Protein backbone atom coordinates (compact mmCIF):
# COMPACT_ATOMS: atom_id res chain seq x y z
CA UNK A 1 0.00 0.00 0.00
CA UNK A 2 0.93 3.64 0.36
CA UNK A 3 3.42 4.00 3.25
CA UNK A 4 2.59 6.60 5.87
CA UNK A 5 3.87 10.13 5.05
CA UNK A 6 6.16 11.67 7.66
CA UNK A 7 4.54 14.46 9.66
CA UNK A 8 4.94 17.85 8.00
CA UNK A 9 6.67 20.39 10.20
CA UNK A 10 5.75 24.07 9.67
CA UNK A 11 9.24 25.40 10.50
CA UNK A 12 12.71 25.02 8.98
CA UNK A 13 15.85 25.46 11.12
CA UNK A 14 18.84 25.00 8.80
CA UNK A 15 22.41 26.11 9.50
CA UNK A 16 25.00 27.71 7.25
CA UNK A 17 28.41 26.12 6.92
CA UNK A 18 30.65 28.35 4.75
CA UNK A 19 33.27 30.23 6.75
CA UNK A 20 34.37 32.95 4.30
CA UNK A 21 32.79 35.59 2.07
CA UNK A 22 33.58 33.48 -1.01
CA UNK A 23 31.18 30.79 0.21
CA UNK A 24 33.96 28.25 -0.30
CA UNK A 25 35.44 26.87 2.96
CA UNK A 26 32.97 24.46 4.60
CA UNK A 27 33.00 24.06 8.37
CA UNK A 28 32.45 20.27 8.59
CA UNK A 29 30.81 20.56 12.02
CA UNK A 30 28.22 23.16 11.01
CA UNK A 31 27.65 21.12 7.84
CA UNK A 32 26.89 17.95 9.82
CA UNK A 33 24.64 20.08 12.04
CA UNK A 34 22.66 21.13 8.94
CA UNK A 35 22.64 17.58 7.55
CA UNK A 36 20.96 16.42 10.77
CA UNK A 37 18.44 19.29 10.91
CA UNK A 38 17.45 18.81 7.26
CA UNK A 39 17.43 14.98 7.10
CA UNK A 40 13.63 14.71 7.55
CA UNK A 41 13.25 17.27 4.76
CA UNK A 42 15.66 15.47 2.42
CA UNK A 43 14.12 12.06 3.16
CA UNK A 44 10.68 13.28 2.05
CA UNK A 45 12.04 15.00 -1.07
CA UNK A 46 13.80 11.72 -1.90
CA UNK A 47 10.62 9.75 -1.21
CA UNK A 48 8.36 11.90 -3.39
CA UNK A 49 10.97 11.89 -6.16
CA UNK A 50 11.43 8.11 -5.88
CA UNK A 51 7.71 7.36 -6.20
CA UNK A 52 7.16 9.98 -8.90
CA UNK A 53 10.09 8.30 -10.68
CA UNK A 54 8.40 4.90 -10.29
CA UNK A 55 5.18 6.11 -11.93
CA UNK A 56 7.14 7.50 -14.88
CA UNK A 57 9.18 4.29 -15.19
CA UNK A 58 6.21 1.93 -15.52
CA UNK A 59 2.90 3.83 -15.63
CA UNK A 60 1.55 2.36 -12.37
CA UNK A 61 -1.00 4.78 -10.88
CA UNK A 62 -0.38 3.40 -7.37
CA UNK A 63 3.01 5.14 -7.26
CA UNK A 64 1.35 8.32 -8.55
CA UNK A 65 -1.46 7.94 -6.00
CA UNK A 66 1.02 7.45 -3.15
CA UNK A 67 2.92 10.52 -4.36
CA UNK A 68 -0.23 12.65 -4.45
CA UNK A 69 -1.24 11.32 -1.03
CA UNK A 70 2.06 12.32 0.60
CA UNK A 71 1.92 15.80 -0.98
CA UNK A 72 -1.65 16.41 0.15
CA UNK A 73 -0.74 15.18 3.63
CA UNK A 74 2.04 17.76 3.89
CA UNK A 75 -0.34 20.32 2.38
CA UNK A 76 -2.96 19.64 5.06
CA UNK A 77 -0.13 19.79 7.62
CA UNK A 78 0.81 23.22 6.26
CA UNK A 79 4.37 21.92 5.94
CA UNK A 80 7.15 24.52 5.61
CA UNK A 81 4.82 27.55 5.79
CA UNK A 82 6.09 28.41 9.26
CA UNK A 83 8.91 30.56 10.55
CA UNK A 84 12.20 30.26 8.66
CA UNK A 85 14.53 30.39 11.65
CA UNK A 86 17.74 32.37 11.05
CA UNK A 87 20.77 30.78 12.73
CA UNK A 88 23.75 32.26 10.90
CA UNK A 89 22.29 33.03 7.44
CA UNK A 90 19.29 32.34 5.17
CA UNK A 91 19.74 28.55 4.97
CA UNK A 92 16.15 27.91 6.06
CA UNK A 93 14.85 30.03 3.19
CA UNK A 94 17.22 28.30 0.75
CA UNK A 95 15.97 24.96 2.06
CA UNK A 96 12.34 25.90 1.42
CA UNK A 97 13.24 26.89 -2.14
CA UNK A 98 14.97 23.57 -2.78
CA UNK A 99 12.16 21.58 -1.16
CA UNK A 100 9.67 23.47 -3.33
CA UNK A 101 11.67 22.42 -6.39
CA UNK A 102 11.45 18.77 -5.35
CA UNK A 103 7.78 18.58 -4.38
CA UNK A 104 6.57 20.77 -7.25
CA UNK A 105 8.51 18.61 -9.72
CA UNK A 106 7.18 15.44 -8.08
CA UNK A 107 3.61 16.76 -8.23
CA UNK A 108 4.12 17.65 -11.89
CA UNK A 109 5.32 14.15 -12.79
CA UNK A 110 2.09 12.62 -11.42
CA UNK A 111 -0.36 15.48 -12.10
CA UNK A 112 -2.32 13.50 -14.73
CA UNK A 113 -3.66 11.20 -11.98
CA UNK A 114 -4.92 13.78 -9.46
CA UNK A 115 -8.53 13.85 -8.29
CA UNK A 116 -10.04 17.34 -8.07
CA UNK A 117 -9.81 16.80 -4.29
CA UNK A 118 -6.04 16.32 -4.53
CA UNK A 119 -5.42 19.44 -6.64
CA UNK A 120 -7.55 21.57 -4.33
CA UNK A 121 -5.47 20.49 -1.33
CA UNK A 122 -2.08 20.54 -3.11
CA UNK A 123 -2.28 23.59 -5.38
CA UNK A 124 -2.78 26.33 -2.72
CA UNK A 125 0.03 24.80 -0.66
CA UNK A 126 2.54 24.98 -3.52
CA UNK A 127 1.30 28.44 -4.54
CA UNK A 128 1.79 29.71 -0.96
CA UNK A 129 5.27 28.21 -0.84
CA UNK A 130 6.09 29.82 -4.20
CA UNK A 131 4.72 33.29 -3.45
CA UNK A 132 6.43 33.20 -0.05
CA UNK A 133 9.71 32.55 -1.87
CA UNK A 134 9.12 35.27 -4.48
CA UNK A 135 8.49 37.77 -1.68
CA UNK A 136 12.06 37.27 -0.44
CA UNK A 137 13.23 38.26 -3.93
CA UNK A 138 11.01 41.35 -4.10
CA UNK A 139 13.69 43.12 -2.02
CA UNK A 140 16.43 44.77 -4.14
CA UNK A 141 18.89 44.15 -1.29
CA UNK A 142 18.87 40.40 -2.07
CA UNK A 143 21.53 39.65 -4.69
CA UNK A 144 20.02 37.37 -7.35
CA UNK A 145 22.63 34.65 -7.83
CA UNK A 146 22.02 30.91 -8.21
CA UNK A 147 19.49 30.97 -5.36
CA UNK A 148 17.22 33.15 -7.48
CA UNK A 149 17.39 30.64 -10.30
CA UNK A 150 16.75 27.61 -8.09
CA UNK A 151 13.80 29.46 -6.62
CA UNK A 152 12.64 30.04 -10.18
CA UNK A 153 12.48 26.30 -10.90
CA UNK A 154 9.92 25.60 -8.18
CA UNK A 155 7.95 28.79 -8.79
CA UNK A 156 7.77 27.91 -12.49
CA UNK A 157 6.80 24.29 -11.77
CA UNK A 158 4.01 25.44 -9.45
CA UNK A 159 2.71 27.88 -12.05
CA UNK A 160 2.68 25.06 -14.60
CA UNK A 161 1.09 22.44 -12.29
CA UNK A 162 -1.46 24.82 -10.75
CA UNK A 163 -2.25 26.75 -13.98
CA UNK A 164 -1.15 30.05 -12.38
CA UNK A 165 0.18 32.33 -15.11
CA UNK A 166 1.52 34.93 -12.67
CA UNK A 167 3.77 32.26 -11.15
CA UNK A 168 4.78 31.14 -14.64
CA UNK A 169 5.80 34.68 -15.59
CA UNK A 170 7.68 34.93 -12.29
CA UNK A 171 9.66 31.77 -13.03
CA UNK A 172 10.37 32.86 -16.61
CA UNK A 173 11.66 36.14 -15.16
CA UNK A 174 14.24 34.39 -12.97
CA UNK A 175 15.27 32.21 -15.92
CA UNK A 176 15.81 35.42 -17.90
CA UNK A 177 17.94 36.85 -15.09
CA UNK A 178 20.07 33.72 -15.43
CA UNK A 179 20.53 33.88 -19.19
CA UNK A 180 21.22 37.62 -18.94
CA UNK A 181 23.89 37.13 -16.24
CA UNK A 182 25.86 34.95 -18.67
CA UNK A 183 28.86 36.90 -19.99
CA UNK A 184 30.38 36.32 -23.44
CA UNK A 185 33.05 34.06 -21.88
CA UNK A 186 30.21 31.91 -20.52
CA UNK A 187 30.83 32.96 -16.92
CA UNK A 188 28.60 34.48 -14.22
CA UNK A 189 30.12 37.43 -12.33
CA UNK A 190 28.55 36.50 -8.97
CA UNK A 191 29.41 32.78 -9.10
CA UNK A 192 32.94 33.74 -10.15
CA UNK A 193 33.18 35.08 -6.57
CA UNK A 194 32.94 31.58 -5.05
CA UNK A 195 36.69 30.93 -5.24
CA UNK A 196 37.22 27.19 -4.83
CA UNK A 197 33.58 26.62 -5.85
CA UNK A 198 33.32 28.97 -8.84
CA UNK A 199 33.17 26.01 -11.24
CA UNK A 200 30.92 24.10 -8.81
CA UNK A 201 28.51 27.01 -8.57
CA UNK A 202 28.52 27.66 -12.32
CA UNK A 203 27.35 24.06 -12.67
CA UNK A 204 24.96 24.69 -9.77
CA UNK A 205 23.56 27.76 -11.54
CA UNK A 206 23.08 25.86 -14.81
CA UNK A 207 21.00 22.84 -13.70
CA UNK A 208 17.89 24.87 -12.68
CA UNK A 209 18.04 27.10 -15.78
CA UNK A 210 18.32 24.05 -18.06
CA UNK A 211 15.51 22.44 -16.06
CA UNK A 212 13.40 25.59 -16.30
CA UNK A 213 14.00 25.53 -20.06
CA UNK A 214 12.63 21.98 -20.12
CA UNK A 215 9.42 22.90 -18.28
CA UNK A 216 9.02 25.61 -20.92
CA UNK A 217 9.13 22.91 -23.60
CA UNK A 218 6.12 21.32 -21.87
CA UNK A 219 4.04 24.31 -22.98
CA UNK A 220 5.76 24.06 -26.37
CA UNK A 221 8.16 26.94 -25.73
CA UNK A 222 11.84 27.06 -26.71
CA UNK A 223 13.79 29.30 -24.33
CA UNK A 224 17.22 27.78 -25.15
CA UNK A 225 17.61 30.42 -27.89
CA UNK A 226 17.51 33.55 -25.73
CA UNK A 227 20.32 36.12 -25.92
CA UNK A 228 22.31 34.51 -28.75
CA UNK A 229 22.08 31.09 -27.05
CA UNK A 230 23.72 32.31 -23.86
CA UNK A 231 22.89 28.97 -22.23
CA UNK A 232 25.17 27.30 -24.80
CA UNK A 233 27.96 29.55 -23.52
CA UNK A 234 27.38 28.66 -19.87
CA UNK A 235 27.00 24.95 -20.64
CA UNK A 236 30.22 25.08 -22.68
CA UNK A 237 32.17 26.63 -19.80
CA UNK A 238 30.88 24.00 -17.36
CA UNK A 239 31.52 20.83 -19.37
CA UNK A 240 34.93 22.06 -20.59
CA UNK A 241 35.69 22.95 -16.99
CA UNK A 242 34.74 19.55 -15.58
CA UNK A 243 37.71 18.16 -17.54
CA UNK A 244 39.89 21.29 -17.63
CA UNK A 245 39.75 23.54 -14.55
CA UNK A 246 42.58 25.74 -15.87
CA UNK A 247 40.36 28.67 -16.89
CA UNK A 248 38.56 28.93 -13.54
CA UNK A 249 41.75 28.18 -11.60
CA UNK A 250 43.33 31.17 -13.41
CA UNK A 251 40.40 33.62 -13.60
CA UNK A 252 39.78 33.00 -9.91
CA UNK A 253 42.63 33.39 -7.47
CA UNK A 254 41.80 29.92 -6.14
CA UNK A 255 42.32 26.35 -7.32
CA UNK A 256 39.12 24.53 -8.23
CA UNK A 257 37.66 21.45 -6.62
CA UNK A 258 36.96 18.91 -9.38
CA UNK A 259 33.46 18.87 -10.81
CA UNK A 260 31.32 16.00 -12.01
CA UNK A 261 28.74 17.93 -14.01
CA UNK A 262 25.16 17.62 -12.79
CA UNK A 263 22.42 15.67 -14.53
CA UNK A 264 21.36 18.68 -16.61
CA UNK A 265 23.65 17.14 -19.23
CA UNK A 266 21.03 14.39 -19.63
CA UNK A 267 18.70 16.98 -21.17
CA UNK A 268 21.17 19.30 -22.90
CA UNK A 269 22.62 16.24 -24.67
CA UNK A 270 19.45 16.36 -26.80
CA UNK A 271 19.52 20.11 -27.45
CA UNK A 272 23.11 21.20 -28.22
CA UNK A 273 24.69 21.09 -31.71
CA UNK A 274 27.36 18.61 -30.63
CA UNK A 275 25.74 16.63 -27.83
CA UNK A 276 28.71 14.28 -28.09
CA UNK A 277 30.70 16.57 -25.77
CA UNK A 278 28.44 15.28 -22.97
CA UNK A 279 29.41 11.61 -23.42
CA UNK A 280 31.78 11.37 -20.44
CA UNK A 281 29.25 13.10 -18.18
CA UNK A 282 26.44 10.88 -19.51
CA UNK A 283 28.48 7.75 -18.79
CA UNK A 284 29.13 8.76 -15.16
CA UNK A 285 25.73 7.16 -14.72
CA UNK A 286 22.01 7.67 -14.09
CA UNK A 287 21.77 11.06 -12.37
CA UNK A 288 19.33 11.46 -9.46
CA UNK A 289 18.60 14.90 -7.99
CA UNK A 290 15.26 15.27 -6.14
CA UNK A 291 15.72 19.02 -5.99
CA UNK A 292 15.92 18.97 -9.81
CA UNK A 293 12.95 16.61 -10.24
CA UNK A 294 14.38 13.18 -9.43
CA UNK A 295 15.65 10.68 -12.02
CA UNK A 296 17.01 13.06 -14.65
CA UNK A 297 18.10 10.20 -16.92
CA UNK A 298 14.54 8.85 -16.94
CA UNK A 299 12.92 12.24 -17.54
CA UNK A 300 15.44 13.16 -20.25
CA UNK A 301 14.79 9.97 -22.20
CA UNK A 302 11.03 9.59 -21.69
CA UNK A 303 9.76 13.01 -20.58
CA UNK A 304 9.04 14.89 -17.35
CA UNK A 305 5.42 13.81 -17.85
CA UNK A 306 3.79 10.76 -19.40
CA UNK A 307 1.08 12.83 -21.11
CA UNK A 308 0.74 16.60 -21.72
Residue numbers in the entry: 22 to 329
What did the article's authors report about this structure?
To gain insight into this possibility, we analyzed the statistical distribution of B-factors in different apo structures at pH 5.0, 7.0, and 9.0, which were solved at comparable resolutions of 2.63, 2.20, and 2.45 Å, respectively. The protein is least flexible at acidic pH, most flexible at neutral pH, and has intermediate flexibility at basic pH. The pH 5.0 and 9.0 apo structures possess higher flexibility at the entry site than at pH 7.0. However, significant rotameric transitions of important substrate-binding residues such as K42, K162, R163, H221, and R312L have been observed at different pH values. At the exit site, K42 exhibits an altered orientation only in the pH 6.5 and 9.0 structures, whereas in pH 5.0 and pH 5.5 there is no change in orientation; interestingly, at pH 7.0 and 8.5 a lack of electron density precluded analysis of the residue orientation. For K162, the altered orientation was observed only for the pH 6.5 and 9.0 structures; for pH 7.0 and pH 8.5 a lack of electron density precluded analysis of residue orientation. For R163, pH 6.5, 7.0, and 9.0 structures have similar rotamers, in contrast to the pH 5.0 and 5.5 structures.
Unlike other PLs, Smlt1473 present in the clinically relevant Stenotrophomonas maltophilia strain K279a demonstrates a wide range of pH-dependent substrate specificities toward multiple, diverse polysaccharides: hyaluronic acid (pH 5.0), poly-β-D-glucuronic (celluronic) acid (pH 7.0), poly-β-D-mannuronic acid, and poly-α-L-guluronate (pH 9.0). To decode the pH-driven multiple substrate specificities and selectivity in this single enzyme, we present the X-ray structures of Smlt1473 determined at multiple pH values in apo and mannuronate-bound states as well as the tetra-hyaluronate-docked structure. We have built and refined the structures from residues A22-L330; electron density for other residues outside this range was either weak or absent. The structure is composed of 13 α-helical segments (α-1 to α-13) connected by 14 loops (L-1 to L-14) and two β-strands (β-1 and β-2) (Fig. 2, B and C (i and ii)).
